[PDB]
Write a protein that binds this ligand. Sequence first.
Ligand code: APR
Ligand code: AMP
Ligand code: RP5
Ligand code: MG
Ligand code: MG
Ligand code: MG
Lengths: 48, 432, 313, 24, 48
Amino acid sequence: SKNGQHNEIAACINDNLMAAMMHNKPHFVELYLGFDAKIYELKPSEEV
Amino acid sequence: SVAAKTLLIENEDGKGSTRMEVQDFMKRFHMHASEDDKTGSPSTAWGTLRFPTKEATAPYLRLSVNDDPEDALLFVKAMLAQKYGETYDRPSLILSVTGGARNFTLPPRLETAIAKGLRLAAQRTNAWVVTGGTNTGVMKLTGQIMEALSKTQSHFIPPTIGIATYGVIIGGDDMTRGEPPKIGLEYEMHKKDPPKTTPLDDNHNLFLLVDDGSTNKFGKEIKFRAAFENAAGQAFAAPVVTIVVQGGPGTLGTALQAVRQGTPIVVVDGSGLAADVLAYAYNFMHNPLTRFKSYTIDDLRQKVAQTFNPKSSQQLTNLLDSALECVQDPNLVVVYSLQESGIDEFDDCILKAIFSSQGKLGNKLKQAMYFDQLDVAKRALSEASKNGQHNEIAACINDNLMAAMMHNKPHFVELYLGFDAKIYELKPSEEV
Amino acid sequence: ISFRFSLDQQATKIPINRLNSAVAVHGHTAEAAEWYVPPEEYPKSGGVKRYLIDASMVPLSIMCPSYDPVEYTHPSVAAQPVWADPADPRKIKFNVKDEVNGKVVDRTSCHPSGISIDSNTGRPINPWGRTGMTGRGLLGKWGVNQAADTVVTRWKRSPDGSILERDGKKVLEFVAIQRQDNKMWAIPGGFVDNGEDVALTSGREFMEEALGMGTSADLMSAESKDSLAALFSSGTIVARIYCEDPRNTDNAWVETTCVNFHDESGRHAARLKLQGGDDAEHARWMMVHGGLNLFASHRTLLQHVTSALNAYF
Amino acid sequence: ISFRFSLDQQATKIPINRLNSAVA
Amino acid sequence: DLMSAESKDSLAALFSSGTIVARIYCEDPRNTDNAWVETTCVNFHDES
Ligand SMILES: Nc1ncnc2c1ncn2[C@@H]1O[C@H](COP(=O)(O)OP(=O)(O)OC[C@H]2O[C@@H](O)[C@H](O)[C@@H]2O)[C@@H](O)[C@H]1O
Ligand SMILES: Nc1ncnc2c1ncn2[C@@H]1O[C@H](COP(=O)(O)O)[C@@H](O)[C@H]1O
Ligand SMILES: O=P(O)(O)OC[C@H]1O[C@@H](O)[C@H](O)[C@@H]1O
Ligand SMILES: [Mg+2]
Ligand SMILES: [Mg+2]
Ligand SMILES: [Mg+2]
């Protein structure tokens, strides 16, 4: 956040929030949601 | 509604208000047909604007750069006095929000934190927030904050004065031509004017369009904005606090004018751009803490060059010199950190800026009472007690105790009563 | 962390065996003769313009046959006050102490070559280069106008009392005045009067400009006077240089002697009530650094003060 | 505060090139 | 690439204070009887 780095943060925040939900870590879910991760722009790993 | 024909302007003596015709008062405002013109012509651009999805209309006045800011202050006072009666709620704080308008991109958490601090300060002090008049960046964000503030209020609504340079406004051509009293003129933010591209913010309650005979040039309203806030500050005996978030070269000029006119500034560090430059400069020149011993003029010059893009050595020298001139007086600059210090200390920075001024001691005690900081009031009283100062303390203790009772602060009531305030020598503000 | 840094810099603190490898970086633009050229419009002259010359054509060793300077003398100087020399410079002796009305005037330049006298008119020629303008201009004395500058310094201290430290050196702080004529910040000082020395001139100008005590404010309490006398008893002449003053001409130029009054403890400096008077508008304590924008060659003077005191610049 | 003052005065502790301006 | 030109002033400042510490004979494996390497050593010390 201090080092700007907006491109690298936005590309990986969604998958990390998703991973936090799968491994049952709610504190990490609230933390990742606080760091500008839009809830409806979450993407699945495989293709349907 | 029926158009006003006469208006009540408060006298220069400060003892009552006299009623006179609007065209007689309004003759003192000028406009420039071209840049070359100096003497000018009668303004003819004043009235009210109606915005979509907004119930109330916002007054606008186009005035010239050479016009007296006291006259514009009289105009704002005369409209509020007309709408809410003579005994309207006077401001005890003028909060000027300046900064980035186009390239104002920020992370959401920083906005919300500044917004929370700004909203609390504004709601507790009934502050007049003066930003620019346009629908961009931090001013638009501040407009949204005061829009939410405007709903919970019942009678008195604090003005959100927008001071913008005329000549950049897409609805500027429609408003000037015509019958001078324009009651409720519709403002079209989506209409396509070819040369100008910057629209007005729909959440601002009043507009001052500063004119200098130019088109599509910015930063012409900076000197008048600092002078108008200073004039307003002297008139209502209230401290003026400027807040700097991000910003370009004109924000640097705004801070420079503000520090030259005696107005304290609060620079939000960690928001990037000009604020980081100002914070770096202040920390280099004044802060004795250890992290800032490696700070240098060369790295500061590198920061100015990387942020502002001066394209020449002389321009870089003038900006760097102006940035160093802003933080020359350590009292007039207060640096807030949104990434190092705590979340609830922004109001402490605003109060420190209020406390850093010279006069208005009763108002400073009142301001300390509004933010619920007894320790600050206790330290100021203790310093006054040590420094003798019996004449200034005895003249203002009664009104402060009275004010503490009106705003429901019992701890402040006990504190003021402990500092030699006789209960039966309390006096009312008006005369029966 | 403060003591660790202070003890650490107290340890590894530090023309023969010295090598400059900057030529590998710059190339043919290593050093250039970056001399002083005054601005085109002479100050307070009503729009009178000089004869423009490039900075690479200025020194007197170089011939320069295309030289047509303008002769200008200010009306204030031409009205003949007490501090102004006569318009005909004959019978005046330069490079030695000359007596005008029984009063001693210095007239000696710090240039190693000295002042050369023109045979045709008897007027002096400036050894520090060409300036595109003859005559006296705003300066009252032919040749060297002796100026005395007073740099009253103290260490820049925090409320806890510790001295502020930048780039491993202690930070200075000097009294700076805003000039009445051109509104640029500067070191207090002024021209040396007839019959007076640098000591009296330095003290008198600092009292008149920075403190405003020159028959216009009030009388000082007389216990405070002993402190000011104690401050002024220890001064070191740090430099005697040529000023880059925009009022300089070919027949009258300002040369300064700089006197530094340093307050090691900071007690005497803190008792000064700064208030701009005489030909100064405002006076304030100002931090000394290399990015300062001051009038004439006062940055060079501050560089000399920090060089002598081993301070930050 | 005592060591800071002591180390600070241990640092900037200090007839030719000497001028007396007390006559002014 | 070309250096930013503010960074260049810093590198020039670093290179302006160098002390020749030694001028010795190299123990270089390419040395022969008719050609040998002898070095002059220049030290650029950064105190800060
Ligand atoms: N008040 C404005 N409103 C809209 N756009 C603006 C404004 N000022 C400048 N711009 C445009 O934004 C571009 C650069 O944006 P910024 O760097 O955000 O401009 P900045 O210098 O920050 O704005 C200065 C202005 O902002 C106000 O807070 C303050 O009153 C000051 O006048 C400029 O080229 C200009 O076209
Ligand atoms: N040698 C001098 N040259 C030019 N001006 C002088 C001189 N001596 C005295 N003055 C006057 O002193 C004013 C400012 O000098 P001072 O007050 O000494 O700083 C000038 O504007 C002149 O009126
Ligand atoms: O009379 P004023 O202009 O105030 O004093 C002369 C100044 O002009 C500068 O070159 C001198 O160093 C000196 O400070
Ligand atoms: Mg003087
Ligand atoms: Mg002077
Ligand atoms: Mg004088």
